[PDB]
């Protein structure tokens, strides 16, 4: 039966049928948003949902026999596995993000339609070039986050109280989001010199970020 299924799975109709399902479960998920819609068609949607989930595991099962090892060395395939697997944990127990993480299957429209794959791959491929910088920065954030925690977290614990909090705040300053009126001006009412910590921080982090982008507009 091997070549029978290898001709079912690999068939245009099979793929195009999967894609047709994604776009339907996709649409169906944007409807599960309406409290109104659930009070009229809630049952329709939960069933339709459970259905598609089977169809996708059947498919993923079929897909595996036709590929075996070759499959668990395909990024795109692994993805579909894990995404469907997430969708498999029952509508219960554990955390509830799993019920929410289900909507990740709409990312299959990327995986199971070229052009997306291409563009996605075009994007991801840039990442290796950045890891030298990214590393540098994370060391930097780690260093400043520590300094910040022990300079400001006594009077300003919301913002710098914990190593993690400083990380968050520092990230915020880096996105330049409300950094002066929101954060540094307050700090200064107590620690006049706080500007000496944040202006340099901003220069460095924005400098690095400009290089990093110019780096990507060459490779």
Q: How many CB atoms lie within 10 A of CB 31?
A: 14
| 33 vs 68, beta carbon nearer its own copies | 33
* Residue 110 lies near its own copies (rule: CB under 8 A): yes
Distance (Å, whole) CA 15 – CA 19: 6
Shortest distance, CB of residue 14 to its own copies, whole angstroms?
22
At residue 33, the 3 state secondary structure works out as coil
Distance (Å, whole) CA 167 – CA 157: 13
Closest to 59 (Cα-Cα) out of 118, 99, 105, 114:
105
* Residue 51 lies near its own copies (rule: CB under 8 A): no
* Residue 29 lies near its own copies (rule: CB under 8 A): yes
132, two tokens:
């030298």
Shortest distance, CB of residue 175 to Ca ion, whole angstroms?
8
* Residue 82 lies near its own copies (rule: CB under 8 A): no
Distance (Å, whole) CA 200 – CA 204: 6
Residues that bind its own copies in the complex, under the rule CB under 8 A: 26, 29-30, 32-34, 97, 100, 103-104, 106-107, 109-110, 115-116, 118-120, 122-123, 126, 132-133, 135-136, 139, 142-143, 146-147, 149-151, 162-163, 168, 171-172, 175-182, 195, 199, 202, 207-208, 210-211, 213-214, 216-218
């Amino acid at each position: 039966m091997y070549l029978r299924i290898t001709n079912i799975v690999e068939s245009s109709f099979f793929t195009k049928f999967i894609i047709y399902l994604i776009v339907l479960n996709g649409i169906t998920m944007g409807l599960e948003t309406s409290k109104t819609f659930m009070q009229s068609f809630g049952v329709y949607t939960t069933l339709f949902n459970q259905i598609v989930i089977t169809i996708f595991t059947i498919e993923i099962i079929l897909r595996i026999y036709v590929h075996r090892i070759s499959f668990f060395k395909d990024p795109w395939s692994l993805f579909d596995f894990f995404v469907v697997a997430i969708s498999l944990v029952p509508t219960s127990s554990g955390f509830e993000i799993l019920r929410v993480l289900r909507v990740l299957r709409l990312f299959r429209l990327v995986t199971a339609v070229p052009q997306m794959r291409k563009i996605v791959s075009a994007l991801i491929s840039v990442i290796p070039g950045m890891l030298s910088v990214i590393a540098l920065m994370t060391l930097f954030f780690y260093i400043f986050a520590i300094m910040a925690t022990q300079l400001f977290g006594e009077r300003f614990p919301e913002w710098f109280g914990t190593l993690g909090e400083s990380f968050y705040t520092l990230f915020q300053v880096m996105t330049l989001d409300d950094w002066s009126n929101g954060i540094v001006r307050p700090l200064m009412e107590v620690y006049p010199y706080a500007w000496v910590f944040f202006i340099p921080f901003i220069f460095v982090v924005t400098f690095v970020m400009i290089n990093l982008v110019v780096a990507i507009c060459v490779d």
